[PDB]
Amino acid sequence: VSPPPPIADEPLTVNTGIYLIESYSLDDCAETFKVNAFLSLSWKDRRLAFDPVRSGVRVKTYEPEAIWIPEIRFVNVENARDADVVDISVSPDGTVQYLERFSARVLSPLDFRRYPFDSQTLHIYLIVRSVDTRNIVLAVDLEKVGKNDDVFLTGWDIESFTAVVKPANFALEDRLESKLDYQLRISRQYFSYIPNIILPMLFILFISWTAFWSTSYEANVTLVVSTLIAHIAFNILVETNCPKTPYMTYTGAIIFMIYLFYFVAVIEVTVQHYLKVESQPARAASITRASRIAFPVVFLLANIILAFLFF
Amino acid sequence: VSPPPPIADEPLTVNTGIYLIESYSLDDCAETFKVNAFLSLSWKDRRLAFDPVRSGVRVKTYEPEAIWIPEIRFVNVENARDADVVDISVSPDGTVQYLERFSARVLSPLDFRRYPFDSQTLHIYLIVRSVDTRNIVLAVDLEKVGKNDDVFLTGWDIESFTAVVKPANFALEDRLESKLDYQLRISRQYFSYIPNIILPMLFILFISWTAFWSTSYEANVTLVVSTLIAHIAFNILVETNCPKTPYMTYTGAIIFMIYLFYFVAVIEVTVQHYLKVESQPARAASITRASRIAFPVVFLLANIILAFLFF
Amino acid sequence: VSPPPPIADEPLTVNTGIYLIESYSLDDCAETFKVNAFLSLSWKDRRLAFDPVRSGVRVKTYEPEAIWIPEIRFVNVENARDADVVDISVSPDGTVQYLERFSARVLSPLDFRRYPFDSQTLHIYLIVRSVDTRNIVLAVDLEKVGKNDDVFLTGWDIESFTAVVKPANFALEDRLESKLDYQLRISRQYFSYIPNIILPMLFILFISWTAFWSTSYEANVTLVVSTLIAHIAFNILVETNCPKTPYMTYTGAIIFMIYLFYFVAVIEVTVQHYLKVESQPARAASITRASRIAFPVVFLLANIILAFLFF
Amino acid sequence: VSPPPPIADEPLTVNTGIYLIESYSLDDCAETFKVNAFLSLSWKDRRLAFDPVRSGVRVKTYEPEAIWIPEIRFVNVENARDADVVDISVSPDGTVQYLERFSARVLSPLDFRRYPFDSQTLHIYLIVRSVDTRNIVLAVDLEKVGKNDDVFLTGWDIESFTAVVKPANFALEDRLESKLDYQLRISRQYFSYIPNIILPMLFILFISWTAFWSTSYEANVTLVVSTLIAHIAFNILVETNCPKTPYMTYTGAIIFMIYLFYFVAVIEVTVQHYLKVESQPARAASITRASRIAFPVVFLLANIILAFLFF
Amino acid sequence: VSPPPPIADEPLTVNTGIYLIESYSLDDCAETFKVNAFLSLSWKDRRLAFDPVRSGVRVKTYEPEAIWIPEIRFVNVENARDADVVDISVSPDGTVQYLERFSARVLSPLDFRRYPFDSQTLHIYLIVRSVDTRNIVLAVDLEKVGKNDDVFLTGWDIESFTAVVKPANFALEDRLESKLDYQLRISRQYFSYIPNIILPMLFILFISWTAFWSTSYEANVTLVVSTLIAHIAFNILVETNCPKTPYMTYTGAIIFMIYLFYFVAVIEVTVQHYLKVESQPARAASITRASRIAFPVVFLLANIILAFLFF
């Protein structure tokens, strides 16, 4: 229980590897996701070297307490990881082969600007603090990085689980720290978004536009205002249950634009009636007639503009 | 505390068995369910063999620390299982009989495509990682698999708890892994759906269809739009409180179709009025007259089509 | 640390007793409840007997580790109970007197068929698995079963805390099990239900029935449909927040019947108008006049029928 | 690790004291509140007496394991308290000075009858069970009982933290129990109630009363019914999120009375119209004229009656 | 062990420093936030002094058990912090350099008076209780206080992480206490508030004001009342999900004022109609004409007054 000594001035290279067993509980609101994975660590400790002939065994198994193990920690975890040592094995030269199974709630931010057509890169940061006697540097064993084929996130297509092989070495509180980046690339698999959210919302908006084919101010007030209540009630029904996002999203803009369309529709209805009351049914009829094309066209173009702006 | 040695080159067969005591907290949203069960393990360690004459005892009881126990883990659990060793018993030949009581929150995906007439297969995966000295393989003792008769999940019929006797042996990180599949088959209790959800949502839709027996555009706008609000408010009332499902479900389609029916009903109402204003009460009356049969018939057929498509 | 030996062939009788200190968090939805209680165990271990004269002491206090204690477990608990040994005391003849303080989230199903006029029987099942050497049977010490007078569940009258003195001995995985049933009888506090839920729901229904005193189809459509929205919004306001119950409840039936009454009221309104439009104000007036008595009477009788059926 | 022996037949007096560091998470629904506090215990165990000359030290510090500490427990806590021993100090005479820092979710019932003008007395019950060798009695050290000035509960004024100095010694399961009552007196902060809840609810109700200045049955149906929906939606907006209270509260009564006022207003509207249709516009006008004063006056009086009844 | 001895009469100075690694789960409702940070402690224990020449080593590493470490605690944490000792290092003069990684749910009150244009100062209070042998005082090592650049709280700009260098030394239960204040200054990201909350809420209000351009009492009742329902439904849609704030906020006032504006708008509508019915269309027209400017102007000024009052 002291770090291994350097042959020359070299730092201790710890070979890492994360193998995802299970990925679950991705909370879009909290920006967290839970993982069940294997963490494999490998380093050279000469104090533990042995001759396979005079020992008989080709590999020696140790208990965590018995030998020096580097203090590897996760940077972005909520509570400290729940680890269980699976195996520790020493090869004749002194190469330790550590493997543990852990579960962790990882904090990784999410970008909803392009929701529900968004892709995310989830991060798992590995860190090691360099000791008094010698410096510790992390390295990636690509043979020890992967994920089980069964690894799923409902409503997401899991593209890849890879690691940024070059560690980000830096000084923190007068000591060296080696930081490794493991990336989980996921893209939204939301198909049912169209018939469940977009299409009913659009039907309600269209229902308001039928007031451009009526002259009954009482039926028109009922149309635009009652559809505005329906629109809001529908949005309470399909609510993301997430706090408001500080930035403007694609879907956020569309919804804003829809509120603006209900507003402008009321203006038209109000004008059409006022012109009729002021015995000017020529202007009242022309406005209503224009609105029949004006509303769908402006809506269609404004959506094309937004879609272009976000994607 | 070292694995038992092989007679010849054979792997160590560990006989498993899960006996469900309690099943609870099935979360449709989270795709999780909690379990209280017995995990019985049984293997042969010759180092432990005894003569009942020299020992006096017909069976020897050990403490977990005293003997070598295989590291059996669950694949799909959220946090590591809460285990309590009930009993460890060695028979004269060296056959170990381990039994522990555990509780675990198991992650198993759910298929809502046929909801609320759906059946689900809940999974409990047992795994063992092969050691340095020898390979470990899992096997099922069918006498040690079952469930208490009292075992219940409110709103589900618990059909069976069985295990896929042939383990899925595979290589992972240069070591053999032996995986076992325990399946909990449950089917839903869909009767209260009819009076609680289907019938009221239907009454609301029918209330809209009474606009095919009226010529009052003001009363008809009120009918279709106000029932559309009622429909949405009712759906907020019977809300599954689950995130939206990425795939299209049977119930999802019906609801979509209902929104489309409210849309088409507004088109009819609008047309009826426009033809009536444009002094064409022949076409206005004929359309309304058709709609009286057109709407119920198309609805009935479209539902028959969907029911056939999903089931 | 081995079970006590039998004088003859008799099984070991462990005398149990649960004393409720606190009862809390009764979750109607989850079908669980939390408890703080004392669990008192008493058995005869001769290996521990002593002469009070030679020992000069009445009773000898032991530490849990020092002596053999039977593995008593709860059948219906979520996580394993949080136990704290209060006292272990041996009398001269070897009668052990164990007492521990525990807290447990107990899973006990609930029957809402007669809600909110329901009574429930909460269960706490104690179990012991018989060992290799000898069989263990549970017994009830009635002097050690009770509850503190301060024991409360908000919204329930706590009737009794008693135990089914005869244990349910049965075989499980070729070993004997001794199961004891502790019952907590609670009845509901239904008074605030009348002014808070029943009466406003009834006022909303009556408001719709005023359409039987009007001939204005526009005012009548507004009446029945707007009260149908009010009814739903009120139900969202008084929502049980519980997943839907798979079975039909008393309150479930009443609400279903209310939805059917809103439906039939729309039929009347529609008919009355159609007959008036078809210049038949004799039938239109007679139907409306009947409905003024038909609706309250049928509602009153249909309730009487339901109340009789459930109680 | 055995209780201290009595000089004469006296019981062991343990001097207690709770000092609130932080109070938080007061859940009105759950009737629980969380606390961070110091629990100071002091008793004389002569077995621990030392000579300051032979020891060098004027006070000796011990580890919890090393000496006999009385088993002090909380009666009304959800899970067992999270304790951390801060200091254990013995002075030559054998006087032990224990101090711990604990956090606990305390269950104390709440009386909402006078909400939001209510005051509550939160309880923290300390208990000690007497042993075989000698009886243990709790006592209060008033110098060791208080609260930090920073101690806050959002929306409450924290009046006092005091203890009922006379313990409630009683027999339980043939052993003596000494109980101590610590009381946290809090009163509510109710000013934002008026503008946030009471006033908008009253504006909506007044909006309905404008139907006493109109003869349009269609505008009047819309007024009373649409305000009844608004009233309900507003109540969903300001919802306490608490299960229904089994007893009738002050606020509960006001809301009930408001529902009754919407009901009676519909009766007026219905009557006024029926009398007008039955060509009796003398009675129709007189009723409406009365209602203009009848409704505000009866409402004002009925509230005065209720306020008097509850306070 | 035992505290270090003083050279002269001086108190023991413990040099503290908190380095935020992760900040997450800021709950505006619960007035709590979670943190992952390093806690660095440093004091001089002469008992540990050594000669680097005689020792060979320039620094000695110890295990927590081996040496005296001061009991540093947090004042405002929910449960006791989850700590893991990273490193303990003694320099030849006996200066201990302790470093641990902890995670804690910190309770810090929030002031919503200026929401959503608010800034908050989150607190982390460090405390040490003075022992009998000697007094302990906390000090800040400014080189050891900071935050990772990646440290984020969604929807907030993290301004600074600093400590109030002068500790709050005070007496508590006849012992000295040294308190340090660590402050996390955050300001809100209010831009998405305008398009998401302020603008749609405003449109809904303007929709009501169109009743000043209509004489149809039926269309006007529908306008003001239906927009009042829309306003409430929209507020249920954008709900903070936070318990009501005991104090009056800026947004609280605006919303109250909006409810008052819906009320006054109904008064106008009612008056305009009553004057028209009482054949006084001169006053009816003049009021409506004034309201067209009166409502926007008074609203604009009243908002200017409020904005000035809060900011």
Ligand SMILES: CC(C)c1cccc(C(C)C)c1O
């Ligand atoms: C006036 C009447 C036809 C009406 C129109 C719009 C909305 C509602 C409800 C949702 C308040 C309504 O009752």
Ligand SMILES: [Cl-]
């Ligand atoms: Cl970690």
Ligand SMILES: [Cl-]
């Ligand atoms: Cl596991």
Ligand SMILES: [Cl-]
């Ligand atoms: Cl248990």
Ligand SMILES: [Cl-]
């Ligand atoms: Cl406790």
Ligand SMILES: [Cl-]
């Ligand atoms: Cl702490």
